[PDB]
Amino acid sequence: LGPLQIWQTDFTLEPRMAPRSWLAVTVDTASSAIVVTQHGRVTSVAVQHHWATAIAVLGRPKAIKTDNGSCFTSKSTREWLARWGIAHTTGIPGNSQGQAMVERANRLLKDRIRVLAEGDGFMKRIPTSKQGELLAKAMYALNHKERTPIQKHWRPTVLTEGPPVKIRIETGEWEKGWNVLVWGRGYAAVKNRDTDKVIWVPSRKVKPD
Amino acid sequence: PRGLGPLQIWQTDFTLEPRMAPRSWLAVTVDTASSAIVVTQHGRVTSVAVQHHWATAIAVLGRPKAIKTDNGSCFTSKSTREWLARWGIAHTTGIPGNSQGQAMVERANRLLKDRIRVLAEGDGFMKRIPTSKQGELLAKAMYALNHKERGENTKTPIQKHWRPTVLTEGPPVKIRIETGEWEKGWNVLVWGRGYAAVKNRDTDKVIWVPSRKVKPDITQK
């Protein structure tokens, strides 16, 4: 189990999004987070463009598993994945470890593009202008509103305090049990985990655990 | 001003990166709280650009309660206004001269562009960047400025964005009041490098003050 360890990339065709109607879809098997990018033609530079992107939005995944399409089997693409430490897995187009996680992403994605499309009247092909914006809006509904992927691979939570530190006590040794709150003008506000005491210490006398 | 937590207040603004031409017009949005960044390439600064930009930043960081940009036509425009309002996002215009604290973004631009310099010259493009590995490079720049801490810090913007640290109480400070004297009774909530959110111990009032006007209140209790 776990986010950013295994992804399922795959291209799909959405006519409504042409010219660039070739859609690259990456899904995180764990989080269920989606990343799609438009393309004129499914090629090696396409996938590599797509992935670099999904990496910027979801993070570096340990491995991606795609079909045996030339765009993934290619030389460049493999050198690429290897230049990033990303394991690759060309599974047969049926199941081969399961690959229907993405196809439901495509359905949700395309179906979503249908409503966002006809919502603004475009009963067919979508204007090259409001194309990115509509696609982008689909990502936001697919990832932020409950049906949550980001609320699953990000794990949003508010932290009441900061990271644990070891401050330097008058004896010259470094004492554990403190946590840093705020930094200001070279001093650090630190809070003792046992007494709840808060004191300001020089940045120099504070080091992490 | 700045935000005391993610998706509270954003600072959008366009910049010019020659190396990224044709589409050398860059739209950059920063989360004043998180310090997370999102940039998108553009051929020309327009209303559909901003709205393209924002839609995207929203997909990556989430829906922000408000964005504060300058008086550029692309933001003051009709569509843009109707757009922000169709999203429930408050808007706030200012002066291009970084007016007040909209300088949080200017640092984004510098870090971004400087970052594109290295990633550029690293692969040899000592000048203009080929239309092909353009997105790629840009994207890699986001990944560095987001998923990897930057400067003195232990957490990355992407981390402080979904797992923000919002203080309950906050340590004591002495802020400089209008008389020039340093007043006690205040505690710092967020201590930016630009401004600090500070809370009165007596009235519970919260106001933003220049970081230079606040100092640690070493007078332990």
Rg measurement of chain A, Å: 23 Å
Query: Number of folding domains of chain A?
Result: 2
Question: Order of strands across the biggest sheet of chain A?
Answer: 9-8-7-6-10
Tell me the structural class of chain A.
alpha+beta
Order of SSEs of chain A: EEEHEHHEHHHEEEEE
CATH architecture classification of the largest domain in chain A: 2-Layer Sandwich
Alpha carbon gap, first and last residue of chain A = 28 Å
Reading off the top of the CATH hierarchy, the class of the largest domain in chain A is best stated as: Alpha Beta
CATH superfamily of the largest domain in chain A: Ribonuclease H-like superfamily/Ribonuclease H
Q: Quickly count the helices of chain A.
A: 6
Number of strands of chain A: 10
Report what the structure shows.
- Chain B: This is Integrase.
- Chain B: Residues 171-219 bind DNA.
- Chain B: Mg(2+) 3 binds at residues 13, 70, 106.
- The structure is a homodimer.
- Helices cover 31% and strands 26% of the residues of chain A.
- Chain A is of the alpha+beta class and 209 residues long.
- The first copy, chain A, has 2 domains: 1-156, Nucleotidyltransferase, domain 5; 157-209, Integrase, C-terminal domain superfamily, retroviral (SH3 type barrels, Roll), CATH 2.30.30.10.
- Chain A has a 5-stranded antiparallel β-sheet with strand order 9-8-7-6-10, with no helix packed on it.
- In chain A, helix 4 crosses helix 5 (132-144).
- The longest helix of chain A has 20 residues, at 100-119.
- Chain A is elongated.
- The two termini of chain A are 28 Å apart.
- At the A-B interface, helix 1, helix 5, strand 7 and strand 9 of A face helix 1, helix 5, strand 7 and strand 10 of B.
